[PDB]
């Protein structure tokens, strides 16, 4: 009486929603993970929702040679 998935895929899906709701919708929620991983970030780019840059978690050492500053030397003390 229970439908078979590989012969009639859609009929099985309706039965599982109605007769095994906890198992069926776990698979549906579990599959929404990958679905939003494919839809939203492309969607967000189009609307202009840009990703924030990472915050610094270490001292941000400036790239390049040292600037050769002249100021606040020892003669400036006192």
């Amino acid at each position: 009486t229970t439908p078979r998935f590989w012969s009639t895929p859609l009929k099985y899906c309706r039965w599982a929603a109605r007769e095994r709701p906890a198992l069926f919708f776990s698979v549906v929620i579990g599959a929404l993970g990958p679905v939003t991983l494919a839809t939203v970030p492309p969607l967000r780019r189009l609307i202009g929702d840009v990703d924030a840059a990472p915050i610094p978690l270490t001292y941000p050492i400036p790239p390049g040679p040292r600037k050769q500053l002249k100021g606040y030397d020892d003669d400036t003390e006192d």
Binding site: W15, R18, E19, P21
Partner: protein, 74 residues
């Protein structure tokens, strides 16, 4: 089991209905299951009783009713 004579009209039940033939929508079926609608309704009944007057009397300062026919100590 049945009385003698012809079977009572419509005594035989109709055949069982398959899942496919149930006259109730999936959204309602899924909603009641996950939301526990009939359990919520039963809880709501208790709140209605929570605000109704209690039946308790404060014995021995108050007494329950007895009749002139009441049979106690001889």
């Amino acid at each position: 089991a049945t009385p003698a004579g012809p079977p009572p009209k419509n005594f035989r039940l109709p055949p069982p209905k398959n899942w496919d033939e149930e006259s109730e929508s999936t959204i309602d079926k899924v909603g009641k299951y996950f939301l526990m609608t009939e359990m919520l309704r039963g809880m709501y009944v208790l709140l209605e009783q929570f605000f109704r007057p209690p039946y308790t009397i404060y014995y021995p300062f108050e007494k329950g009713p007895i009749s002139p026919r009441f049979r106690g100590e001889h």
